Symmetry: C3
Subunit: 332 residues, 3 copies
């Protein structure tokens, strides 16, 4: 019942990085609980979301869609300084699904242009969680404008398999999947707007159709392909955190599997094994662990193939290494 | 021999509330008697006054939550007053045989029927009308509810230890497809039959015009918000008889969740959001640790804040600065 | 050395039936030989005579279910006759490498190819065509099926105890997007190629015009209804290569279900309904206890009864009044 003295906890500052990459961290905690300090600056900005040059007024956390992945360990405290520069035009806030109370922090972080605030919450549950803006009355508009990301709360002793044995990854990637509803004019062409506010009415209309115009990884069609394809080597253990703050998705690694998967992303639950495809409910973050055994190109996709190959929810993995004819081979 | 079992008559209560019951069974198997009267009635489903011809079990959308224990025999007397105009029946997902009972409970206006079935499997289950050839029309008109079949030794965590809730609420999520004219305005009809054709066309778009909790937009908000106190253990039963949903407690979690609602399976822990497939009932257990307002929503945020799938929790108690605070 | 492994030839069977096999392996690993011939053909998918240019594996929608055991080697000879017009290939979700085999099995009309891969993971998996740049078009044209890789010691329950089925059926669920003209009538094409543009357009609406089992509305009804007898243990393998579905046996349950179909995971028990994500194959085990007609459906009742995702079981045996009965 007595208060816990948090001033005694050591503090560590984190420098966030743009997705799909993840800031420096340790899987197995090397210290006891800490107050981990993060700072994110909200940025309203125009963003090209497809190959035809379609542009929208994106609402971002730190300039990217999705926002950066934050990483802490179970029972650490997350302290976020949220800044809303006066160059922005809208009210924003933040809802951490990893947090307990005040609408995930949303009721304590409402900031208008020119204001800032610092939120602190205890990361009491291990897993990957979604975080997103949630201004009362305009929630889906902000979220579907790209204002969402994720946070991973690692067990202090790292990841474990269904038998309680260590699962250690060599690389980690964060794939934020985004459903966009770009308004179209009477002619069927995407509309343009001077300011975010000007598009509200049309945006609401576009959203209520429940039919996305685009569904992409890392903010745009092909964002995770070509020179920006994810990479790995045969033998490498890779963890892919995947989030969707507003709509269901079903990740799948073409040519591979999800050896160990936490579809709804909570680590106190044993992972599902050998998944071909897994369902991540809208408003959830999930994580899949895989060890590559074949070199070459792999397609990482939302397995509703239309959403993947037509709407944009598809990325690539370029894997190096020696081919395994035992696992698979063309018979002459 | 069923005739040797105790018989008890239950008085059902309107959702989100639930009739009184014991979690850990107090007796052995019993024949639990329920009675529900079918009522076709106009219902306002949104703040704009939109009306539909609702098809209900006991006058509410969703129908009330029935509660029994594993291996009890459910005995339902279903009445279809001659004031209604359609044939109805009932399909219990908790039952075995005759299309969930649908093939044995067909009742035209002015008729009634009594069905009895053994609740052999523990968990929360959906029950809904299913008249041959017009199944989705009735279900999407609000004719569905749920039944909870508790394990005889109560709920258990992933370690087989007891989980006892202090409060329970039943949230029925309903997808509606209200027909519109060429102008785009919702159409009104004199009778349910008049709208069949338009209804079918509206349903086939697979795009709900409304998705609500307890029959209407904002039904579980304001004076009708759900309540709890810091420290209270709350079980929230959630059903969707026709379409997928993804429940989420904003500011909270599903400490223990049976997403597809069957208790022989250990619960999933610490869920932020969970998927309840259409045609399924799920259950989430949570112990409140912070006072204040919480939003309970389908986490497709468009479906929640635009279409109506959102409710509120008003929680009393003292704030916990350790769990969360605005830094000085 | 695979040259050391004995080989066995399998004769595939048209769905919903499955080719014979042993649940518990009677020998060590084997190289199992399969042969499938691709066939592009016009196909009637509804009771109104609507046709489409279907792209099939062995002439059926879905393609046949292949069955092997963990660690066997699957060797498939894929033939693309010069009577076809498009390039095709195959993607095995059960395989490891080269885009599931798609990058190694590309075959134009008049060509064939043989692919071999080790079945390292037990479970039911989807296989489908995946020609670069036209993946969804082929898959939604019916070019997909499934393969089951049984654990060498057969299926086991959540306790490690054996689960042996007396019957097994394979239900392939297909979402079709048939283009329509300005009048709203389904369009007709002389060749698959001529429809591409309209096909892409129709798919991007993400709204299927049809959702069927075994290639057509009512395909699994009447003389083609699935069958069983009271007391029989039945395994129903269900796949959806492109869109989510939620199987449900009306009047029954999924006693043991591997919703996402991977056997190294214990099954979920007593399911009323389960979610099989698009791009996944699932399996449900049930022991019938009541005779009569059952409806096996996708529980989004609109997709089932309006769009076509519904089939029937005809079960023989004695009625059990203890489980269910109409009172006087
Ligand atoms: Cu915002
Ligand atoms: Cu949220
Ligand atoms: Cu009815
Ligand atoms: Cu049902
Ligand atoms: Cu093909
Ligand atoms: Cu695939």
């Amino acid at each position: 019942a007595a208060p816990v003295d948090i001033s005694t906890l050591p503090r560590v500052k984190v420098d966030l990085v743009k997705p799909p990459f993840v800031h420096a961290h340790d899987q197995v905690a090397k210290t006891g609980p800490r107050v981990v300090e993060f700072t994110m600056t909200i940025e309203e900005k125009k963003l090209v979301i497809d190959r035809e040059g379609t542009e929208i007024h994106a609402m971002t956390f730190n300039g990217s869609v999705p926002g950066p992945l934050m990483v802490v360990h179970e029972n650490d405290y997350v302290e976020l300084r949220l800044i809303n520069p006066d160059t922005n035009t809208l009210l924003h806030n933040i809802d951490f699904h990893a947090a307990t109370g005040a609408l995930g922090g949303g009721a304590l972080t409402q900031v208008n242009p020119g204001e800032e605030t610092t939120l602190r919450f205890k990361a009491t549950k291990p897993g990957v969680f979604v975080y997103h803006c949630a201004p009362e009355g305009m929630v889906p508009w902000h979220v579907t404008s790209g204002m969402n990301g994720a946070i991973m709360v690692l067990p202090r002793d790292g990841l474990k398999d269904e038998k309680g044995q260590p699962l250690t990854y060599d690389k980690i990637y964060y794939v934020g999947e985004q459903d966009f509803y770009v308004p179209k004019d009477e002619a069927g062409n995407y509309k343009k707007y001077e300011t975010p506010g000007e598009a509200y009415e049309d945006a609401v209309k576009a959203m209520r159709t429940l039919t996305p115009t685009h569904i992409v990884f890392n903010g745009a069609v092909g964002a995770l392909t070509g020179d920006h394809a994810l990479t790995a080597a045969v033998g490498e253990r890779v963890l892919v955190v995947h989030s969707q703050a507003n709509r269901d998705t079903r990740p799948h690694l073409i040519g591979g599997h999800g050896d160990y998967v936490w579809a709804t992303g909570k680590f106190r639950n044993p992972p599902d094994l050998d998944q071909e495809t897994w369902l991540i409910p809208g408003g959830t973050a999930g994580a899949a662990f895989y060890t590559f055994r074949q070199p070459g190109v792999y397609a990482y996709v939302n397995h509703n193939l239309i959403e993947a190959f037509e709407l944009g929810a598809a990325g690539h993995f370029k894997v190096t290494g020696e081919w395994n004819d035992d696992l698979m081979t063309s018979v002459v």
